Design a protein around this ligand. Sequence first.
Ligand SMILES: CC[N+](CC)(CC)Cc1ccccc1
Ligand SMILES: [Mg+2]
Ligand SMILES: [Mg+2]
Ligand SMILES: [Mg+2]
Length: 340
Amino acid sequence: AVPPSLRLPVIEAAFPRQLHPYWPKLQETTRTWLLEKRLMPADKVEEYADGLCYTDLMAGYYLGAPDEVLQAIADYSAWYFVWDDRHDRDIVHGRAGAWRRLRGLLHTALDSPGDHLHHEDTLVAGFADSVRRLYAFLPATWNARFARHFHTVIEAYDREFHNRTRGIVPGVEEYLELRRLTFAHWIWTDLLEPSSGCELPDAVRKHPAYRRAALLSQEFAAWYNDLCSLPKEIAGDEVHNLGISLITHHSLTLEEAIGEVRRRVEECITEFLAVERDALRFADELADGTVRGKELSGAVRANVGNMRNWFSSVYWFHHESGRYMVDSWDDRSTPPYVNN
Ligand SMILES: CC[N+](CC)(CC)Cc1ccccc1
Ligand SMILES: [Mg+2]
Ligand SMILES: [Mg+2]
Ligand SMILES: [Mg+2]
């Protein structure tokens, strides 16, 4: 049962949850990886890792992925959550120098992961290990696009460091543009392709129906996170959240901003439903009778199916994960799974 202020009946009725068959082994394998890469203290991994549900989130998203692909995606995604925690803690503790150094190492490790596999900063070494494995599935042209996208993500995190140290809440339009980068919209979209086993040519993945379906899936996910993580983010002096931008710059009340965010999330769903039809029609056109065409057709169909699965996986993740349960913390500004 989902709280009424967070409930989306269309998701519950029309987007049935999916779970990848590898998820049991995925759960333990990623937890051991967090342990062995020293990405979180051992006692916090034991106490909190399974309850954070990071592997469940990815296992309900990239259906059909080969087990080894899903493992690399799950390790990268767990790393990404820890990086968000590190970013937050560097901000809270005014560690501008340590962040600047981290920011630079992640740029370098993204271009040359093998050089960073044993870096003294375990967060860098953990990133390099996951990126190394992601680079082993598709041609170097896909690797280059992943890197180009993630370079921008790192720099969007640096913009968040600038905003939060300076006490700046971005405007609504400014926030929406930045959120497509801090959420890594295009990274999750890139990773559809190794999950279906096919790098898509530019003419396919830029087709208007594919691009708009991919966008809507990510806008829903990011804004639903905003809706669900608003309580912890207000408690933690986070400034990056559509709700916070609305309260600050449009002088909405909390209740008004929650409603506005809800409506925007709801429209992503029904816009997606319409564009989903066009994207599946495109998949049908790709099946032109050739072997390449059937290949491309099946890949697009699988990818669009997983764009749909992102809606349900993100929805349920926010009600299962301990990441957001701010009411259970002794210090509402300091989550217990963060190294402070
Ligand atoms: C801050 C963590 N995360 C994912 C690693 C960064 C993009 C956002 C997120 C939250 C909830 C579901 C999916 C992604
Ligand atoms: Mg965060
Ligand atoms: Mg963040
Ligand atoms: Mg959030």
